[PDB]
């Protein structure tokens, strides 16, 4: 999941005009930072909503081959996988969208 | 004599409504080396496109556009690049670059699909640099070069090729008619290096400079008045310019390689470990 | 080491206009793999050296 960090950093990176056109329009420092982590752990969110989709979809899977073998919900595991998804989220989120809050306007809009 | 270009009745055409439109129609063209040509004509008459028949950019499935005799149709589009390192030169507005190249490299470039040692053709380039008469700019990325100097690393780079043809996109109007023109001039002395060479303009004032102005319309010109070898340089030349890329993003290639790292590093121990237990 | 492909594929993106200089300069079709696959291959390896490196020191 850490190379989503990068993926995320290089979104931002394209956004640096963006950036500058949202804190022309007023926005607060911490709005950009605010905007982008959430839709980084919205990410991880959704990838976790089709991730134990797929899980449960193994966990019948299994359910199929039955030498005795039994399949048992976790559904305490299920809500710490995606608390850990989204504690992951804000775990990569963070910095690089710390360093757009860093950013000036100017530099963001002048640059060419 | 038979000029070294013949576009007799050439025209391409462009599906739009799910057939093609009359982007060219049938025209009839010869040339000669050491020519200078215009291309005046309204903007977007595809004088662009047929600009890409001289760029031998696609087929235009009609007339026989025969480059020194031998039509474009017959040879491959490959072969075509062959013929662009045999002779094209190539020079734009924009005067397009990496960014990550010095401008030596810039010029570099087109010889590097060449065969050919790195150190003679960097001796030419440097020869091509005094020509363009830059020198301490040799280093520089072409963000730290002069707008007219990026240029300048174009038409080097169209020598690098010998600049047998060279095509031009709007060579002065990116910026002043000192080094426009001046470089117009320098233009005027490869007419007298006798390479062919072909502006491309809707402007009749940058135009007057060229030898021969062209005027297009309607899809027809309503006048004409007068190897294994670069697989392992590639390896090594290409390993330069993947550090280079890298340098674009050193840390992006960070979270990348480190992603590799753990990774890697994990299954090493992982099999070692549990290998080791198991002993 | 998936995701690496999508970075691949953002720097390729970004590319874009550099491809287009690149088969101006009469690259073949071929080249662009060549030279982008083996810088990906070679961010695979370098991080394998260092990754084994790491290994080691684990050991």
């Given at each position: ?47 976790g909503a089709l991730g134990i989709t797929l899980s449960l979809l193994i966990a019948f899977t299994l359910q199929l081959f039955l030498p005795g073998w039994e399949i048992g919900f976790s559904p305490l595991a299920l809500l710490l996988a995606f608390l850990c998804s ?27 | ?273 549990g ?5």
């Amino acid at each position: 999941g850490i190379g989503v960090m990068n993926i995320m950093l290089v979104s931002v990176t394209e956004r640096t005009r963006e950036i500058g056109i949202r804190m022309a329009v007023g926005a607060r420092a911490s709005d950009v930072l605010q905007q982008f982590l959430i839709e980084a752990v919205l990410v991880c969110l959704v990838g976790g909503a089709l991730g134990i989709t797929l899980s449960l979809l193994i966990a019948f899977t299994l359910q199929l081959f039955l030498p005795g073998w039994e399949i048992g919900f976790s559904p305490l595991a299920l809500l710490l996988a995606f608390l850990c998804s989204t504690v992951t989220g804000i775990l990569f989120g963070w910095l690089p969208a710390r360093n757009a809050a860093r950013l000036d306007p100017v530099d963001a809009l002048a640059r060419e | 004599m038979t000029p070294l270009l013949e576009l007799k009745d050439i025209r391409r055409s462009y599906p739009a409504g799910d057939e093609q439109v009359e982007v060219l129609k049938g025209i009839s063209l010869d040339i000669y080396a050491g020519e200078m040509v215009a291309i005046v004509g309204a903007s977007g008459s595809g004088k662009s496109t047929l600009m890409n028949i001289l760029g031998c950019l696609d087929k235009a499935t009609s007339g026989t556009y025969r480059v020194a005799g031998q039509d474009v149709a017959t040879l491959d589009a490959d072969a075509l690049a062959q013929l662009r390192r045999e002779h094209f030169g190539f020079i734009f507005q924009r005067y397009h670059l990496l960014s990550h190249l010095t401008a030596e490299q810039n010029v570099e470039v087109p010889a590097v699909y060449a065969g050919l040692e790195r150190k003679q053709r960097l001796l030419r380039a440097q020869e091509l640099l005094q020509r363009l008469g830059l020198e301490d700019r040799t280093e520089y990325y072409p963000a730290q070069l002069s707008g007219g100097q990026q240029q300048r690393v174009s038409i080097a780079r169209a020598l690098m090729n010998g600049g047998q043809v060279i095509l031009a996109d709007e060579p002065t109007g990116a910026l002043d008619s000192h080094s426009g023109e001046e470089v117009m001039a320098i233009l005027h002395q490869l007419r007298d290096r006798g390479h062919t060479v072909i502006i491309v303009t809707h402007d009749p004032q940058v135009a007057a400079q060229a030898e021969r102005v062209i005027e297009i319309r309607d899809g027809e010109i309503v006048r004409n008045p007068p190897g294994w070898r670069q697989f392992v340089s590639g390896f090594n030349e290409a390993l330069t310019m993947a550090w280079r890329a890298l340098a674009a993003n050193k840390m992006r290639t960070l979270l990348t390689m480190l992603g590799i790292i753990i990774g890697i590093a994990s299954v090493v121990s992982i099999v070692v470990v549990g290998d080791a237990a198991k002993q």
